[PDB]
Amino acid sequence: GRATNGQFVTKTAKVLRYKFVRWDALLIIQFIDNIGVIENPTFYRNKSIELRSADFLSPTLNNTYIVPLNGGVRVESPTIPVQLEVILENNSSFIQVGFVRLTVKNGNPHMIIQCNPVPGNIKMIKIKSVMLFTCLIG
Amino acid sequence: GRATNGQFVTKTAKVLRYKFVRWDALLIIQFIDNIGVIENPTFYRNKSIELRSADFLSPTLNNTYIVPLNGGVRVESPTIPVQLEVILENNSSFIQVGFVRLTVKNGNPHMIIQCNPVPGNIKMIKIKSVMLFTCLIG
Amino acid sequence: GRATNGQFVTKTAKVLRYKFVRWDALLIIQFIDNIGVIENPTFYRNKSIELRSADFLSPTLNNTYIVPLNGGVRVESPTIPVQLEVILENNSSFIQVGFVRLTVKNGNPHMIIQCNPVPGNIKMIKIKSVMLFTCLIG
């Protein structure tokens, strides 16, 4: 039981808030920055987690973006698929099914985001899904 | 422990049966209408949850279909991706990766279903995946 | 609590190792053969679970591959979406969002893998995602 607040922080000092439950064996963690809402009987708003070029390790292979993180938990999560929008520097954009994991390198957490080839360089990825990882410890 | 039966009901009085577990903090809920089966060593049958135009709020922006619901639980779920089939009025159809959440507007549960542009108007979405949401309460 | 080791075995005696937790009602199971790693600040390696033509039931309808299994647990899981790579006999390959379930036929576990049409016959599917199923018992 009850759901404890947490956060990561990115290179550019962006703060990714989450809630979790540790039950151990079991860690279940949800990002809470971008919970979509219905405004109007014609309109649902997706909110985004906005990650910029500066939050990624340069350089990138295989459209795999590594977002090194500080604080929060060190888990090897499963892969979850998400709704992405990838924003090129030329400001065209592509909707994609992305795939996200949490992983631990050195002493540190990282988010892995994997998407499809885009015809340009990337200024921003936005995650438009509400993300929850169910993790197994050890 | 053990798994309690529940249901929602749609505008057109369709009944979406599920099982759940509340452990609280934690709510884990599975839709049980469409559990696929192997009939024959050559054949697996996906079953569908069939949602019609009449179950959605008209009008729809961004290929986002809001299915207002009565009964069952009020949760803000994460987004899950699913296998959809979208059936146009002209009866062509498209397989898609859709994304589904549960959300709460006013006092009421809603299912959000988000898919890709189709070249026509929609008569039916069928969800062909077995859907389970792991939710965090509060 | 704590996470118990398990495995399935395929027709070709491939061994698919997993960890699980049974809490019952609740079974949460993770495949552990292919946990990706960061080697270098430019490189994350996806690992694959490699399933071959011989692990599937011939013949296949609807790009649905049935992998009959021995040992481990008998669950009807939800569908999870994954990163696939499908390798044709002509050795071209396609990245896809696949969908995987566990299911039980006769007395036996099966993995279901569902992907998109490919322009040829398949030698191998590789699952490149880290797969975790949260299951409800009964």
Numbering used by the authors:
A (entry chain A), B (entry chain A), C (entry chain A): 317 to 454
From the paper:
The TAdV-3 fibre protein has 454 residues, of which 1–45 are probably the tail domain that binds to the penton base, 46–303 form a putative shaft domain with fifteen triple beta-spiral sequence repeats and 304–454 may form the head domain. Here we describe the crystallographic structure of this carboxy-terminal end of the TAdV-3 fibre and confirm it as a globular, trimeric head domain which, surprisingly, most closely resembles the structure of reovirus fibre heads. We compare the structures of the virulent and avirulent fibre heads, and show that, in both cases, the head domain can bind sialyllactose.
The model was also independently refined against data collected from crystals of the native, non-selenomethionine-containing avirulent and virulent forms, and here manual adjustment resulted in a model containing the same 138 residues plus ordered solvent. The structures of avirulent and virulent forms are virtually identical (root mean squared difference (r.m.s.d.) of 0.53 Å when the C-alpha atoms of residues 317–454 are superposed). The largest difference is in the C'C"-loop, which moves upwards by up to 3 Å. This loop is near the two residues that differ between the avirulent and virulent forms, i.e. near residue 354 located in the C'-strand (Met in the avirulent form and Ile in the virulent form), but also near in space to residue 376 in the C"D-loop of a neighbouring monomer, which is Met in the avirulent form and Thr in the virulent form. Both proteins bound 3'-sialyllactose with two- to four-fold higher affinity than 6'-sialyllactose, while the avirulent form of the protein bound sialyllactose more strongly than the virulent form (1.5- to 3-fold). In crystals of the virulent variant soaked with either of the two sialyllactoses, some positive electron difference density was also obtained, but not convincing enough to allow modelling.
